[PDB]
Amino acid sequence: KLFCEPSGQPASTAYGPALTGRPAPLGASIDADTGAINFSVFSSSAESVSLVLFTEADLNAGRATFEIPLDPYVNRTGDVWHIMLPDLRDDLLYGYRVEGVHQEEDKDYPGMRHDKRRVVLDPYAVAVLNRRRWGQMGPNLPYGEEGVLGVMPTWPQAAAALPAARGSAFDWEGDTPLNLPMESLVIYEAHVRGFTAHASSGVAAPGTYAGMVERLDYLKSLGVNAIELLPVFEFNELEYYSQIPGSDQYRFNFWGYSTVNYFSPMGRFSAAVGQGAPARASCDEFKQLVKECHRRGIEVILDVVFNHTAEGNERGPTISFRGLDNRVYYMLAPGGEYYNYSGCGNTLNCNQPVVRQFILDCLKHWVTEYHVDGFRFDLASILTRAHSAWHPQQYDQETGQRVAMSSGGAIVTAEGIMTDGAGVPTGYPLADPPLVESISEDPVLRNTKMIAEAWDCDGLNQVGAFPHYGGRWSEWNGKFRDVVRNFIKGTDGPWAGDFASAICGSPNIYANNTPHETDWWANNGGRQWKGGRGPHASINFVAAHDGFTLADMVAYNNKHNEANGENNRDGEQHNNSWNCGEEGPTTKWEVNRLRQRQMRNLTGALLLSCGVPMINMGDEYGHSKNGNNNTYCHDSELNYLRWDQLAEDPHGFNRFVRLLIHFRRATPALQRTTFVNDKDIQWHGELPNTPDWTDTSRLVAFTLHDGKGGGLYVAFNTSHLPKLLQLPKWGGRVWQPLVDTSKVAPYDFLAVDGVLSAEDVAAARRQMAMWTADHTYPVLPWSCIVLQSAPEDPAATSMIK
Amino acid sequence: FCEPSGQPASTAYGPALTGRPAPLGASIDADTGAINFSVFSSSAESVSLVLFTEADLNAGRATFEIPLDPYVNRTGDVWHIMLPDLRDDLLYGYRVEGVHQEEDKDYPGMRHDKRRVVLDPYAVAVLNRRRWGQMGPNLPYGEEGVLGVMPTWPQAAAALPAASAFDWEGDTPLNLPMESLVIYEAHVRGFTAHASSGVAAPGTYAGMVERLDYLKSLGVNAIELLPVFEFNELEYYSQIPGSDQYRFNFWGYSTVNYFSPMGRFSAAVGQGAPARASCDEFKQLVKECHRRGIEVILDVVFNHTAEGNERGPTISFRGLDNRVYYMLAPGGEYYNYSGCGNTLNCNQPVVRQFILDCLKHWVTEYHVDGFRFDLASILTRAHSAWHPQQYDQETGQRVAMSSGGAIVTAEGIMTDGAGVPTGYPLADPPLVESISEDPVLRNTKMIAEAWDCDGLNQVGAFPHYGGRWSEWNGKFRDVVRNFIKGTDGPWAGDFASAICGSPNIYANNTPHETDWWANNGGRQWKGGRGPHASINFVAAHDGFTLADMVAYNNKHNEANDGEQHNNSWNCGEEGPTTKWEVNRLRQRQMRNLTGALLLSCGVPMINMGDEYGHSKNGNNNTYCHDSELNYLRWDQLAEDPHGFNRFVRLLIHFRRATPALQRTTFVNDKDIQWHGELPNTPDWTDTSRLVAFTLHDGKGGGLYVAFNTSHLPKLLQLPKWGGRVWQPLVDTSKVAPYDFLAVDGVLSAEDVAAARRQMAMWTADHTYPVLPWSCIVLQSAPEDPAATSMIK
Ligand SMILES: *[C@@H]1O[C@H](CO)[C@@H](O[C@H]2O[C@H](CO)[C@@H](O[C@H]3O[C@H](CO)[C@@H](O[C@H]4O[C@H](CO)[C@@H](O[C@H]5O[C@H](CO)[C@@H](O[C@H]6O[C@H](CO)[C@@H](O[C@H]7O[C@H](CO)[C@@H](O)[C@H](O)[C@H]7O)[C@H](O)[C@H]6O)[C@H](O)[C@H]5O)[C@H](O)[C@H]4O)[C@H](O)[C@H]3O)[C@H](O)[C@H]2O)[C@H](O)[C@H]1O
Ligand SMILES: *[C@@H]1O[C@H](CO)[C@@H](O[C@H]2O[C@H](CO)[C@@H](O[C@H]3O[C@H](CO)[C@@H](O[C@H]4O[C@H](CO)[C@@H](O[C@H]5O[C@H](CO)[C@@H](O[C@H]6O[C@H](CO)[C@@H](O[C@H]7O[C@H](CO)[C@@H](O)[C@H](O)[C@H]7O)[C@H](O)[C@H]6O)[C@H](O)[C@H]5O)[C@H](O)[C@H]4O)[C@H](O)[C@H]3O)[C@H](O)[C@H]2O)[C@H](O)[C@H]1O
Ligand SMILES: OC[C@H]1O[C@H](O[C@H]2[C@H](O)[C@@H](O)[C@@H](O[C@H]3[C@H](O)[C@@H](O)[C@@H](O)O[C@@H]3CO)O[C@@H]2CO)[C@H](O)[C@@H](O)[C@@H]1O
Ligand SMILES: OC[C@H]1O[C@H](O[C@H]2[C@H](O)[C@@H](O)[C@@H](O[C@H]3[C@H](O)[C@@H](O)[C@@H](O)O[C@@H]3CO)O[C@@H]2CO)[C@H](O)[C@@H](O)[C@@H]1O
Ligand SMILES: OC[C@H]1O[C@H](O[C@H]2[C@H](O)[C@@H](O)[C@@H](O[C@H]3[C@H](O)[C@@H](O)[C@@H](O)O[C@@H]3CO)O[C@@H]2CO)[C@H](O)[C@@H](O)[C@@H]1O
Ligand SMILES: OC[C@H]1O[C@H](O)[C@H](O)[C@@H](O)[C@@H]1O
């Protein structure tokens, strides 16, 4: 009955005799009055659970240091196994050896995959230790043979770190989440390793959290106020380890979309872990990073991958969920086959109530413990899909043994199709997925920003209609990307009209609510989610870590992923790109000229649109992956911030981008929570108020008011020919040049900085005064301008100085 | 030895000697040191030499009078006397007695009056009134013994030769190749009269010297002076109803004496110095021009004199030999091809020789470099001849002759003695021939204003004697003015020709169907000349200012005549305005006209003031105004409110630095090519508003030039020259100083490089945007792909 009562297992050279303990909280926690360590882990299906303890030396030799088997009657309440250890030695790490049935051993129990030869990881582990250093192979052991822990050299035994002692807690120094209004954000999408891994970073600890801190100043000076980190939860970079043919380079799991543990920071991004620090060092190093971001005005948004795990399918390794309770954690068919909506091996059983709670807890854990500001949910559609349910295992009354069940205990239709227990066939996209409801409504998370990549690998696309619970979710707007890429490169079809919509924050998606005639989601489950949102629901992007780099969108018609080892079958097939006249690096002046313009024209579309822009690390200076549009597996300069190329800025593109960011941020009209109307914005062409929406259009142009008598004139000429634009006349006022991608840098962006003085800017405005007074502006093919309304001053046409 | 001629000595000289007829004028006998006086009159009966102290001259009174013996003191029609040991501070004239036609109708054309004392045509210096605008004395003119005509025309006298020659310090005329000239038409008083000039002696030869560095810095290498031969600025002295101000003869197109420099442009004469002081003041001016590589070209007026018609004053020729010196009908009426009252008898032999002697004088004595011939057509016309006077061998008295001795046809029409009707324009005028062939003048430039007031126009075919003559090209003016304002018609085509040095006017051997001169007297002159035959101008002292032809549709001459068809456009409003679009457009058009002028083959001339936007407030004939209308506004030049003076200055230097525009032969199709919005696709239609051309430098480089005269802007596809890109230099659509991208005190070489780079994407695309009513000049340069990287 009582938690303090000893449970029978004897003391050791490193702990007191075990006590009963408690179900809550899940994970390992410090008991407050005794100082002891309570362990709690869920499994509905395990027959036995042992807590396994390791020193690092023993961990590395594939052996346990101590084992404590839990009594199934004492050390268990419902489905939560638990035990407590006083005087536990700090140099020890922990896991669980879970015994039960496996389907390959007995057909009658499909979905069960217990294996006592493995020691599995606590899902709620605060920190994980296995391999200390990025890219370091696991130790050479006789894996597979009796008594040795670990799957293979690329998957050695891992273990969880004990909770920190009372009195030892992080000095936040009064740090808090920043809660910046969403519409005010400029998101930079970044990878922790790649941010400083290149020799040119010059940081003390390349490719780490601490390293990232040394170069955070550059981001603040760039004008960014949010950073979105690619997956930061423990993953195994050696999981795709193999040789690249034609090379001695080896491929890795670099990006990290394959999560081993969701509660622990990636240890092989921690400088301290590389230097031999205890496993929790990653925790405090990550905290430090978040503190440093916040000091600099930068929010932290974590890319989280709750739709599949590193365990893959049946052929993958057993490291956590599979060996604890495979039927609970993964989405399974009645035979035990893994659903593969992720396209990565398995699908997490998101709406199953234990799993739901896991995810809730996880998000609260990162917000509360690490002061994070938001999450970006990889393939978020899978979080809408209905789970697989199994009946609770029924045991024999007299015998105590295990009783087999109709359909293995899978809850099915009369036709055998799998079900969520509540009458919904497994996989069905729910209009009201209870996981998403809980995320949207949990008080701990109420000021936390949520962003959905609203699609998955089974062709489900929910953009415009992700279950958003009152405007509580924004979305990666891939239609924006497609529209901007198409319109800017110069293309027939609806792209001018669509581009104008993109510029306005895509009201055609988020405000409008009449669905496509053949779109099943929008006509059914998504129906109620279709309006009731603003332009800030749209995360706008032209490029991401996925797909072509900005520079490569203008240098490559086609992808070149041969080095990825899926023989070019991977990555986006339709990039809507144009090489500007020749594939890859060229010597032709005409083509390079054009690319310099196109890069800026695309950036202009991005930073001059309503909604919320996101920039892919590197795109702000011309970064190239040599035409590889899916560099998930390369630990090389293809995925690193080129501090050397940034400094060089050979055509002044970084200056242009920086300055446009700052300008965007100084322009309230661009940062809205409600959609612009005809008083806010007007559309033009070669003549004022005469836009071209035809299929052959190559021009979109508009005025944007500032509600103080001023505003901007913006134009995108996507023709192969130059044009003379007649500008709308605002009485008493004249348009003044600011942006012009026709001009060689620095005259492509007329604002004061280290390169152009106030005098230089005024001189450059006066030069054109005859043109602007005339309300006439010449534009180059494939070019972009931004002008500002100023009070007319007839003295502008007299001699300058 | 010259025999004594019998006249007594006096306090001022010794017993007179006979003297010689040569040289004409007053001169020093090399043998005795005596002053020899010589003077032509075939018609006179008596001639007395009259001498004046300055005091006596001022009081209308002669100090001495020496009657000449008609036998001993005369050889042929030349009267002469020598006076030894003459007080050199006296001045001289002649009292000439003879018949007058009003006192006797039998002698039409004779206008002797012995109450007058007339000036030596060959006078080296004249004294009459010492200061500009100074009224003559208030004498009882017309009464017995009082000399002078009225207060505006008091008695003049001529100075004697000096017995201390000027120090030229090796000065010679510069003999610059004609094709290298940029000419500045200027007026000696107007140049420094304005308070802002800040000179010691405003409005004088000495004052002009003090500001010549301005002209050198401007890049001008020839100055053409409005008439510096003595004239009477009080000829038109009269009050202007509007104002306090009086009307003058300001410009000076009404000469009193052709051999004397205008005394009232001399600071020294105005200060009481002897009359000769102006000779040295003028020599100093020429010397100082030459030190600065500036040539001196004199505007000369040999087609008429200040004596007007029969209602004007007898001061010189009329009283000496009216019949010789003036073009007369058989009743003694004054032909008036000049539109001024008289016509000088240019091709009669004594007259011819006078003009020639005059030109030689100014070249030899004053080191002048060239002449501009006012209404030069008049010098091509046949003169009027009269039989030599007949006297009774018995009585000695005059004999009347048939027709008054006029040499007429059977129908009574006047003739030149050799069968040509008086006034007929000659293919081979001996005066123009002599000018063209005389060795003294062989390296002297000659410029004809080849028309006159009876509608004779000879441009394209002035008798030029192997290209010895250039001409004011009035076609250029009209064409450039019409093309640049935007005007339907043949203007684009004519403008292209104007740019080529007007070969349609000077090398075109095919004359018009109707033009008499070209089909007859001028036929032999219709070719054999290069573009340097054409003196190009957009404006001159006559007509509208550059500024004003862009600000006024119609003239405004109330305060006074003046051109009626000006081909101007005010750019949207008459005169001054606050409308911004008008002022902007005027600023461009000033540059656009000046560009047409300075980017054309031939020889450009700039009218004083037009390099800073000088205005005459819409008055297009300011001949009678001694005021800031005709003064160089040093204050306004200093202000340069929209950088127009800078623009002009640079354009002039750039032109001098461009051999391709300074030619003695005409451009062919290898030299120049004609483009439009597309390369090699010009528009010659009646609605054309664009002319553009490439001009080779002979080294693989060259210029792209274009004038958009449309009201709409254009995009221009430039012609692609392999391995090369066009760089911006001139763009009249850019606000100064970016209208002219050249290094000076305002733009660094850094500034220029950066201005060029800005546009590297436009030029590499071979695409150039131009504003309406604008003009650009680009410069072919080797292609540098790195131009489009960061300027840095
Ligand atoms: C938003 O969303 C997406 C997705 O989240 C992001 O997309 C990017 O990231 C993706 C994931 O990184 C990436 O996809 C690529 O990887 C996945 C796998 O994660 C691939 O998925 C398919 O193919 C794999 C591999 O064929 C299948 O895996 C199954 O089979 C293998 C067995 O072949 C199992 O591997 C396991 O066992 C092997 C063998 O024992 C282990 O390898 C070991 O031995 C080898 C030699 O024999 C050695 O080479 C190796 O070093 C040893 O370790 C291995 O470690 C172990 O995992 C799997 O477990 C099993 O599931 C999948 O079933 C199948 O779906 C894709 O094809 C790849 O493209 C995307 O391209 C990225 O774009 C996106 O970025 C986000 O925005
Ligand atoms: C090249 O080509 C041309 C021409 O060379 C240049 O053109 C410019 O210069 C022109 C010449 O300066 C200028 O023309 C203007 O002036 C001329 C004359 O020089 C005019 O010619 C016509 O009209 C006049 C005036 O009616 C005629 O004059 C004749 O009659 C008058 C009147 O009697 C005579 O005047 C003489 O008599 C009176 C007697 O009392 C004297 O006046 C005095 O009393 C006045 C009051 O009662 C006082 O006010 C006055 O101050 C007193 O002195 C007068 O002084 C005296 O001379 C004339 O002698 C007699 O011939 C002409 O015959 C007739 O042809 C033009 O009409 C004028 O426009 C042009 O406008 C310029 O553009 C050009 O610049 C070059 O490219
Ligand atoms: O140069 C003359 C030509 O220019 C214009 O066509 C260009 C397009 O604007 C430009 O986007 C690109 O088109 C490519 C598509 O974007 C790409 O998806 C793929 O299909 O290849 C196309 C080119 O190979 O390039 C073309 C021209 O190269 C203009 O639209 C034409 O009308 C014009 O004749
Ligand atoms: O005026 C404010 C208005 O701006 C935006 O509307 C523009 C659209 O984005 C744009 O596509 C275009 O719409 C036209 C279609 O493209 C065309 O095919 C045809 O059907 O006509 C449509 C209407 O013109 O132009 C509109 C502006 O007229 C924004 O989307 C609006 O919500 C906003 O109110
Ligand atoms: O290219 C060398 C050539 O240039 C100049 O000739 C141009 C003329 O100046 C210009 O008027 C124009 O002539 C055209 C007429 O206006 C038109 O009405 C019709 O008759 O055709 C004419 C041309 O075909 O163009 C010519 C250039 O062709 C200049 O006159 C010469 O010095 C030189 O030979
Ligand atoms: O399912 C995968 C795909 O879904 C969506 O249709 C997106 O447009 C695409 O970018 C994404 O990768």
CA-CA-CA-CA dihedral for A314, A316, A318, A322, to nearest 10: -40
Hey, are the CB atoms on A744 and B757 less than 8 Å from each other?
A: yes
> Contacts from B108-111 at CB under 8 Å and sequence distance 24+?
B108/B328, B108/B330, B108/B331, B108/B332, B108/B404, B108/B406, B109/B322, B109/B323, B109/B328, B109/B332, B109/B386, B109/B404, B109/B406, B110/B43, B110/B322, B110/B323, B110/B332, B111/B310, B111/B314, B111/B318, B111/B319, B111/B322, B111/B332
Residues A666 and A698 in one domain: no
Minimum CA–CA partner of A588 in chain B: B785
Q: What is the distance, to the nearest Å, from the Cα of residue A27 to the centroid of all Cα atoms in its chain? A: 26
Residues A658 and A672 in one domain: yes
Mutate to test the pocket of ligand 6, among A344, A461, A475, A542 (most ligand atoms within 8 A of CB): A461
Residues A396 and A458 in one domain: yes
What are B150's strand-pairing partners? Answer: B153
Best CA proximity match to A345, nearest among A384, A378, A309, A304: A309
Strands A473-477 and A538-540: parallel
- Contact list in A for residue B763 (CB cut-off 8 A) is none
**How many CB atoms within 10 Å of residue A216?**
17
Chain B residues contacting A via beta carbons under 8 Å: 580-581, 583-584, 587-588, 640-643, 646, 713-715, 733-738, 746, 754, 757-762, 764-765, 767, 769, 771-772, 783, 785, 787-792
> What kind of experiment solved this structure?
X-ray
Residues B398 and B519 in one domain: yes
Residue nearest to atom 8 of ligand 6 (CA): A478
> What is the Å distance from ligand 6's center to B253 Cα?
91
Please state, in angstroms and rounded to a whole number, the distance separating the CA atoms of residues A541 and A451: 13
- Asked if residue B7 lies in contact with residue B80, where contact means CB atoms within 8 angstroms, the answer is no
Scanning A21-105, the segments in alpha helix (DSSP H) are 56-60
Buried b (16+ CB within 10 A) or exposed e, B23-50: ebbbbebeebebbbbbbbbebbeebbbb
Residues B302 and B440 in one domain: yes
CA-CA-CA-CA dihedral for B342, B347, B348, B352, to nearest 10: 100
Residues B617 and B685 in one domain: no
Q: A13 in helix, strand or coil?
A: coil
Residue nearest to atom 10 of ligand 5 (CA): B493
**Residue B753: which region, alpha, beta or left (left: phi > 0; alpha: psi -120 to 50)?**
alpha
Q: Is B623 in the pocket of ligand 2 (CB under 6 A)?
A: yes
> What is the Å distance from ligand 1's center to A310 Cα?
8
Mutate to test the pocket of ligand 5, among B475, B500, B673 (most ligand atoms within 8 A of CB): B500
DSSP letters, B712-746, are S-EEEEPPPPTTEEEEEEEETTSPTTTTB---SSS
- Contact list in A for residue B643 (CB cut-off 8 A) is 798-800
Please state, in angstroms and rounded to a whole number, the distance separating the CA atoms of residues B252 and B226: 7
Best CA proximity match to A369, nearest among A281, A268, A267, A286: A286
DSSP conformational letter for B161 = P
Last residue of a domain, one of B669, B690, B723: B669
* B189 Cβ contact list (under 8 Å, min separation 6): B132, B203, B204, B250, B265, B626, B630
- Asked if residue B30 lies in contact with residue B20, where contact means CB atoms within 8 angstroms, the answer is no
Residues A346 and A391 in one domain: yes
- Asked if residue B660 lies in contact with residue B695, where contact means CB atoms within 8 angstroms, the answer is yes
- N- to C-terminal Cα separation, chain A: 92
The domain that contains B146 carries what CATH number? 2.60.40.10
With vertex at residue A605, the alpha carbon angle to CA A533 and CA A526, rounded to the nearest 5 degrees, is 25
Hey, are the CB atoms on B787 and A744 less than 8 Å from each other?
A: yes
With vertex at residue B226, the alpha carbon angle to CA B225 and CA B231, rounded to the nearest 5 degrees, is 125
Scanning A61-191, the segments in alpha helix (DSSP H) are none
CB-side exposure of A73: number of CA atoms within 13 Å?
Answer: 2
Scanning B556-684, the segments in alpha helix (DSSP H) are 580-598, 634-639, 644-656
Hey, are the CB atoms on A589 and B788 less than 8 Å from each other?
A: yes
Q: B488 in helix, strand or coil?
A: coil
Question: Nearest CA to CA, how far is A729 from chain B (Å)?
Answer: 14
- Contact list in A for residue B789 (CB cut-off 8 A) is 650-652, 744
Hey, are the CB atoms on A767 and B734 less than 8 Å from each other?
A: yes
Q: Which two tokens stand for residue A107?
A: 């057909």
Please state, in angstroms and rounded to a whole number, the distance separating the CA atoms of residues B190 and B188: 6
Residues B18 and B113 in one domain: yes
C-alpha separations of B370 from A561, B396, B538 in Å: 82, 48, 21
Resolution (angstroms) equals 2.4
**Residue A780: which region, alpha, beta or left (left: phi > 0; alpha: psi -120 to 50)?**
beta
> What is the Å distance from ligand 5's center to B775 Cα?
20
Best CA proximity match to B267, nearest among B276, B280, B255, B278: B278
Burial class (CB in 10 A: 0-12, 13-18, 19+), A618: buried
Residues B212 and B119 in one domain: no
Scanning A7-64, the segments in alpha helix (DSSP H) are 56-60
Burial class (CB in 10 A: 0-12, 13-18, 19+), A469: middle
Nearest ligand, measured from the Cα of A340: 1
Q: Which of B715, B737, B771 sits opposite A800 (nearest CB)?
A: B737
Name the residue range of residue A708's domain: 679-801
C-alpha separations of A322 from A23, A131, A395 in Å: 21, 22, 22
Please state, in angstroms and rounded to a whole number, the distance separating the CA atoms of residues A139 and B430: 120
Q: B324 in helix, strand or coil?
A: helix
Hey, are the CB atoms on A651 and B789 less than 8 Å from each other?
A: yes
With vertex at residue A296, the alpha carbon angle to CA A291 and CA A302, rounded to the nearest 5 degrees, is 55
Q: Which two tokens stand for residue A203?
A: 């940081």
Best CA proximity match to A748, nearest among B630, B185, B384, B788: B788
Catalytic residue selected from B307, B449, B542, B731: B449
Please state, in angstroms and rounded to a whole number, the distance separating the CA atoms of residues A472 and A436: 10
- Split into its structural domains, chain B has a count of 3
DSSP conformational letter for A600 = H
Buried b (16+ CB within 10 A) or exposed e, B169-195: eebebbebebbebbbbbbbbbbbbbbe
- Asked if residue B230 lies in contact with residue B275, where contact means CB atoms within 8 angstroms, the answer is no
> Contacts from A87-91 at CB under 8 Å and sequence distance 24+?
A87/A14, A87/A15, A87/A16, A87/A36, A88/A14, A88/A15, A88/A36, A88/A37, A88/A162, A89/A14, A89/A15, A90/A162, A90/A165, A90/A278, A91/A55, A91/A56
DSSP conformational letter for A529 = G
Residue nearest to atom 25 of ligand 4 (CA): A497
Residues A202 and A244 in one domain: yes
Last residue of a domain, one of A141, A164, A187: A164
Please state, in angstroms and rounded to a whole number, the distance separating the CA atoms of residues B237 and B228: 19
**How many CB atoms within 10 Å of residue A543?**
27
Q: List the strands of the sheet with A76-77, edge to edge.
A: A27-30, A37-42, A80-85, A76-77
* B46 Cβ contact list (under 8 Å, min separation 6): B67, B68, B70, B95, B96, B97, B98, B114
Residues A237 and A117 in one domain: no
**Residue B590: which region, alpha, beta or left (left: phi > 0; alpha: psi -120 to 50)?**
alpha
Q: Is A546 in the pocket of ligand 1 (CB under 6 A)?
A: yes
- Asked if residue A664 lies in contact with residue A228, where contact means CB atoms within 8 angstroms, the answer is no
The domain that contains B264 carries what CATH number? 3.20.20.80
**How many CB atoms within 10 Å of residue B639?**
13
Percentages helix, strand, coil for chain B, rounded to the nearest 5?
25, 20, 55
Please state, in angstroms and rounded to a whole number, the distance separating the CA atoms of residues B383 and B367: 31
Q: Which two tokens stand for residue B154?
A: 């008091």
Please state, in angstroms and rounded to a whole number, the distance separating the CA atoms of residues A490 and A576: 11
Q: Which two tokens stand for residue B305?
A: 């004199």
Please state, in angstroms and rounded to a whole number, the distance separating the CA atoms of residues B363 and B374: 18
Residue nearest to atom 21 of ligand 4 (CA): A693
Count of pairs with CB atoms under 8 A, one residue in A, one in B: 119
Question: Nearest CA to CA, how far is A728 from chain B (Å)?
Answer: 16
Q: Can you tell me which residue has the tokens 């007829």?
A: B21
Residue A746 preceded by cis peptide, ω within 30: yes
Scanning B599-672, the segments in alpha helix (DSSP H) are 634-639, 644-656
* A357 Cβ contact list (under 8 Å, min separation 6): none
C-alpha separations of A649 from A588, A620, A753, B754 in Å: 20, 10, 15, 18
Cα dihedral sign, A623-A627-A628-A634: negative
What are B539's strand-pairing partners? Answer: none
Strands B91-97 and B157-159: antiparallel
Nearest ligand, measured from the Cα of A237: 1
> What is the Å distance from ligand 3's center to A720 Cα?
8
- Strand spans (E) along B13-125: 25-28, 35-40, 46-52, 64-67, 74-75, 78-83, 91-97
Please state, in angstroms and rounded to a whole number, the distance separating the CA atoms of residues B601 and B666: 8
- Asked if residue B236 lies in contact with residue B316, where contact means CB atoms within 8 angstroms, the answer is no
Cα dihedral sign, B596-B600-B605-B608: positive
Strands B35-40 and B46-52: unpaired
- Please report which helix (H) or strand (E) contains residue A438, including its range: helix A434-441
Question: Nearest CA to CA, how far is A743 from chain B (Å)?
Answer: 5
Residue B23 preceded by cis peptide, ω within 30: yes
Best CA proximity match to B644, nearest among B607, B706, B591, B597: B591
With vertex at residue A579, the alpha carbon angle to CA A575 and CA A581, rounded to the nearest 5 degrees, is 150
- Contact list in A for residue B592 (CB cut-off 8 A) is none
With vertex at residue B544, the alpha carbon angle to CA B540 and CA B545, rounded to the nearest 5 degrees, is 70
- Please report which helix (H) or strand (E) contains residue B213, including its range: helix B212-218
Q: A224 in helix, strand or coil?
A: coil
What are A410's strand-pairing partners? Answer: A390
Q: Is A523 in the pocket of ligand 6 (CB under 6 A)?
A: no
Crossing angle for the helix pair A478-489 and A495-503, nearest 10 degrees?
130
Last residue of a domain, one of B116, B142, B162: B162
| Residue A41, φ and ψ in degrees, nearest 5 | -145, 135
Q: Quick one: which atom of ligand 1 is closest to the CA of A155?
A: 53
The domain that contains A787 carries what CATH number? 2.60.40.1180
Burial class (CB in 10 A: 0-12, 13-18, 19+), B673: middle
Hey, are the CB atoms on B767 and A755 less than 8 Å from each other?
A: no
Scanning A490-622, the segments in alpha helix (DSSP H) are 495-503, 507-510, 520-523, 550-553, 589-607
- Asked if residue A548 lies in contact with residue A629, where contact means CB atoms within 8 angstroms, the answer is yes
Hey, are the CB atoms on B769 and A589 less than 8 Å from each other?
A: no
Mutate to test the pocket of ligand 2, among B237, B314, B340 (most ligand atoms within 8 A of CB): B340
* A203 Cβ contact list (under 8 Å, min separation 6): A196, A211, A214, A215
- Asked if residue B62 lies in contact with residue B395, where contact means CB atoms within 8 angstroms, the answer is no
Residues B298 and B411 in one domain: yes
